[PDB]
């Protein structure tokens, strides 16, 4: 029955039902920062991320709560993570190295070819010789062992490491927990649940957090709702990811794909698109 529209197009509000699992993410650059036997996720008064995750799990007793982690954790840390699963019936630790994301890979060489043709297809003296040389040299230096975009990102230890694999996890969307249903509700660990989510709706089954604090409005990647795996708005984001080797910070492949999917251009109304896309919940403090 029920529809909304944006930029003169109609979209179905689609259900994100009560079995949709919740996913949180923590990627740890420095696992040595924890005491022996503690779970290597920050849990300070300022950033009580682990407590927030467990709080959500206690509140949503009939949903699966996942913790998507990555980093060079010790055996002793793996033990602590395992204890956390044991103390909570509905909590699952998901290590990035155990997930197969290979369906979403692209070869680095393919990416360089594309980047290179495009540079080569430039007017006689608009060509960037400095850039082309560098790109060609970079391409020569790739081994077949290491010729994967995913492998490169998995060795990274910064923010790009986190975002790249968040995007992949949102595509898997529930397949990542391989009871649980097929969408995913992705939340930042600083978000606090104060009650049950219930049934949620989103346009074409996707929504994103909009922060309205400071009397300003900004789309944030901090919470994302998807109703199905491989959502097309996210696959658009995957194309942007596939078109770069080392995307610059704030390239925001994810954001770009979603906006592209709803035809939100730089000339469209930003406030309208925020109202439309927003994930807002009375029982979550975001």
Residue numbers in the entry: 21 to 198, 209 to 316
What did the original publication write about this model?
The non-LEE encoded effector protein B (NleB) has GT activity and inhibits NF-κB activation by transferring N-acetyl glucosamine (GlcNAc) to host death domain-containing proteins and to glyceraldehyde 3-phosphate dehydrogenase (GAPDH). The glycosylation target is an arginine residue, which was unexpected because the guanidine group of arginine is nucleophilically poor at physiological pH. The T3SS effectors SseK1 and SseK2 from Salmonella typhimurium SL1344 are NleB orthologs that behave as NleB1-like GTs, although they differ in protein substrate specificity. Here, by using a combination of X-ray crystallography, STD-NMR, enzyme kinetics, molecular dynamics simulations, and in vivo experiments, we show that these enzymes are GT-A fold retaining GTs that most likely follow an SNi mechanism.
NleB2 from E. coli O145:H28 was solved in its unliganded form. For NleB2, amino acids 317–326 at the C-terminus were deleted for better crystal packing and Cys21 and Cys199 were also substituted to serine. The overall crystal structures of SseK1 and SseK2 from S. typhimurium as well as NleB2 from enteropathogenic E. coli are similar, revealing high identities between the amino acids at the active binding site level. Furthermore, the sequence alignment shows that the NleB family lacks the arginine residue, though a conserved Trp is present at the C-terminus. We would expect that both the SseK and NleB families have a different conformational behavior of the lid-domain. Each HEN residue of SseK3 is on the β-strand, but in the case of SseK1, SseK2, and NleB2, the HEN residues are located on the loop structure. This has implications for the differences in the activity of the enzymes due to the HEN motif because the loop structure is more flexible than the β-strand. Although the tertiary structure of NleB1 is likely similar to NleB2, SseK1, and SseK2, a previous study has reported that NleB2 has a lower activity than NleB1 on the same target (TRADD).
